Amino acid sequence: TIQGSIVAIVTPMLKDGGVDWKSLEKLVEWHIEQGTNSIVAVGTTGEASTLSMEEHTQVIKEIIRVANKRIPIIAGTGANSTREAIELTKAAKDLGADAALLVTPYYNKPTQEGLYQHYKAIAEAVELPLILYNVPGRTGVDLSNDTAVRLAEIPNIVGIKDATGDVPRGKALIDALNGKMAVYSGDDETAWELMLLGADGNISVTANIAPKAMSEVCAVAIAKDEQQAKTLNNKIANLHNILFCESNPIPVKWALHEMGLIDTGIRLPLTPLAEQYREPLRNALKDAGII
Amino acid sequence: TIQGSIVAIVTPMLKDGGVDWKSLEKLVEWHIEQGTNSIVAVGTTGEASTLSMEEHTQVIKEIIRVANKRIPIIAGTGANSTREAIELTKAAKDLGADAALLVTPYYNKPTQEGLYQHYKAIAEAVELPLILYNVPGRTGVDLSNDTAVRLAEIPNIVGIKDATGDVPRGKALIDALNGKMAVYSGDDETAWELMLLGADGNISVTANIAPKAMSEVCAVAIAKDEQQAKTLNNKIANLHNILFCESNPIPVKWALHEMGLIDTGIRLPLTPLAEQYREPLRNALKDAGII
Numbered sequence: 337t338i339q340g341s342i343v344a345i346v347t348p349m350l351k352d353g354g355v356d357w358k359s360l361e362k363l364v365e366w367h368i369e370q371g372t373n374s375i376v377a378v379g380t381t382g383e384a385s386t387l388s389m390e391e392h393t394q395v396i397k398e399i400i401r402v403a404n405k406r407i408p409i410i411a412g413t414g415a416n417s418t419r420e421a422i423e424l425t426k427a428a429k430d431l432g433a434d435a436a437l438l439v440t441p442y443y444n445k446p447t448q449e450g451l452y453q454h455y456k457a458i459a460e461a462v463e464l465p466l467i468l469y470n471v472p473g474r475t476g477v478d479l480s481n482d483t484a485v486r487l488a489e490i491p492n493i494v495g496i497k498d499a500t501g502d503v504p505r506g507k508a509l510i511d512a513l514n515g516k517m518a519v520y521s522g523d524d525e526t527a528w529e530l531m532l533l534g535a536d537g538n539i540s541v542t543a544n545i546a547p548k549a550m551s552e553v554c555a556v557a558i559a560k561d562e563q564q565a566k567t568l569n570n571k572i573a574n575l576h577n578i579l580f581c582e583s584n585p586i587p588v589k590w591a592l593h594e595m596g597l598i599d600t601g602i603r604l605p606l607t608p609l610a611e612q613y614r615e616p617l618r619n620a621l622k623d624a625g626i627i
Numbered sequence: 628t629i630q631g632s633i634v635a636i637v638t639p640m641l642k643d644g645g646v647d648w649k650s651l652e653k654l655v656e657w658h659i660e661q662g663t664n665s666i667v668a669v670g671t672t673g674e675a676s677t678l679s680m681e682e683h684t685q686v687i688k689e690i691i692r693v694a695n696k697r698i699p700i701i702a703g704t705g706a707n708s709t710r711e712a713i714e715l716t717k718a719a720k721d722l723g724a725d726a727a728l729l730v731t732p733y734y735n736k737p738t739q740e741g742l743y744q745h746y747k748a749i750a751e752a753v754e755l756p757l758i759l760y761n762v763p764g765r766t767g768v769d770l771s772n773d774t775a776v777r778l779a780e781i782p783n784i785v786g787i788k789d790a791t792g793d794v795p796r797g798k799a800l801i802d803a804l805n806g807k808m809a810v811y812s813g814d815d816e817t818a819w820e821l822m823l824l825g826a827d828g829n830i831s832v833t834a835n836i837a838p839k840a841m842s843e844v845c846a847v848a849i850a851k852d853e854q855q856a857k858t859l860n861n862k863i864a865n866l867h868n869i870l871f872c873e874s875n876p877i878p879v880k881w882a883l884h885e886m887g888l889i890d891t892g893i894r895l896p897l898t899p900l901a902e903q904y905r906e907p908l909r910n911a912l913k914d915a916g917i918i
């Protein structure tokens with residue numbers, strides 16, 4: 337169901353590290369304006385890790401309050417604790433979220449069976465649509481294809497954000513599923529292919545700075561028009577790259593700063609994009625005509 | 628300054644998942660009797676991840692209580708949020724812990740400067756001996772040896788638990804430091820060796836089930852008695868592989884239960900040891916002469 341360009345929105349902040357609400361609001365209007373099809377409130381890009389449970393909720397609320405049921409809101413509710421995860425996902429449901437995005441427990445390295453029990457428990461406790469998120473590189477674990485298929489077997493588990501970048505792998509998964517649950521790309525670099533291979537959209541980082549372009553690439557990629565997917569994606573490829581020259585979302589948050597859309601806020605352990613990649617990013621933004 | 632066999636103690640649980648204060652005290656009293664030099668309260672092996680801040684504090688509290696100041700107690704105060712890490716570290720300092728172990732921020736993948744700043748911030752915020760902890764495999768990040776050496780400059784940043792298993796790298800660190808801060812092995816398998824090369828001890832998983840044996844091994848390798856370290860390690864060198872047949876602390880918590888010391892308690896996303904590894908471990912234990 338949820339399709340298109342789904343931007344994983346940053347959580348704008350002030351120089352001191354407090355959430356920047358006036359700037360958060362403006363960004364939601366701007367995505368809805370620009371053609372963004374949905375939004376993940378407080379995902380990895382949203383500095384979920386450095387936000388308190390209250391800020392997590394406040395943001396989820398604000399994004400839902402400014403969206404005003406105009407486009408669906410997916411609430412970031414992952415945790416490396418099953419219990420903790422149930423608490424954020426219910427909070428989300430109560431706040432009126434359309435769906436929840438739960439990354440695989442990071443750092444405690446659960447077994448594949450633990451990964452199965454973890455999600456099932458969450459699925460049977462809060463009646464909300466749930467979208468799994470696999471990004472081994474960050475978590476320390478890797479939700480196998482077979483595990484994903486066992487889970488698509490659960491009422492409430494409706495999709496899986498796939499950030500491997502491993503396309504044929506992503507393809508195997510989409511095929512094995514036969515439409516039982518959605519798949520979205522969690523890798524901007526190869527999202528156009530994944531969607532061209534039948535993925536329901538991209539939970540995009542690049543979409544923070546180029547929402548129109550992206551939703552256009554998504555539309556035509558889900559539409560199965562190979563050449564336009566390539567042709568329009570190519571206009572923004574350089575961006576999928578330069579936005580990870582440092583850990584996401586260090587750069588995109590600097591990208592948005594150069595765009596004049598947010599202040600330089602970012603919570604430690606994260607840091608402002610290193611002075612070294614600031615001209616390199618500034619040009620890439622100019623080559624793409626975003627400024 | 629704290630040296631020898633340092634056990635990352637498990638956090639015993641009842642079938643329902645709540646802490647087993649009865650058994651926890653027994654294990655603390657039994658590690659002291661066996662020869663364990665220090666305990667790490669609520670670290671990875673102790674499920675810091677699935678215990679609330681309330682429980683996190685209760686456990687450091689109880690372990691500090693029962694030890695009665697007979698051995699030093701290190702508190703696992705790590706978090707991937709700087710502000711949070713500071714709160715966890717403060718509570719430890721208030722509870723009366725001797726030092727604090729802080730795994731590098733996990734999952735948000737900070738830059739090396741981010742790592743430097745993060746720890747620099749905790750050191751200046753809390754007046755307490757601190758022990759860095761690097762385990763790329765679970766965090767998605769790698770505290771470079773050069774960042775570690777930079778960080779050794781900071782007054783109360785007094786050591787680093789290297790879990791890489793990368794011995795050459797390990798010695799190169801021990802060398803560069805020239806005593807600026809203590810180095811511990813975060814890897815049982817190669818600990819005996821790292822210690823022969825200058826390391827101040829092992830923050831050991833195996834010490835959970837073979838405290839006396841590890842205690843023996845730590846001492847002799849700290850004495851630089853090569854053959855002895857080697858000969859004693861052998862007694863247990865196979866237990867270093869079996870305790871990780873699944874994600875630590877999954878195997879270890881079983882062993883302790885097989886040793887009739889704790890109940891089957893373990894929190895999701897983690898699970899009881901998979902049946903296919905139960906006999907194998909039992910016989911590895913029996914071999915070692917533990918059961």
Ligand SMILES: NC[C@H](O)CC[C@H](N)C(=O)O
Pocket residue numbers: 384385386387388389390392414415416707708734
């Ligand atoms: N308070 C919100 C929540 O902590 C954010 C999740 C973050 N990854 C963490 O476990 O710290």
Ligand SMILES: NC[C@H](O)CC[C@H](N)C(=O)O
Pocket residue numbers: 416443675676677678679680683705706707
């Ligand atoms: N102390 C509660 C806190 O949520 C612990 C979870 C944290 N992600 C950890 O690895 O320790």
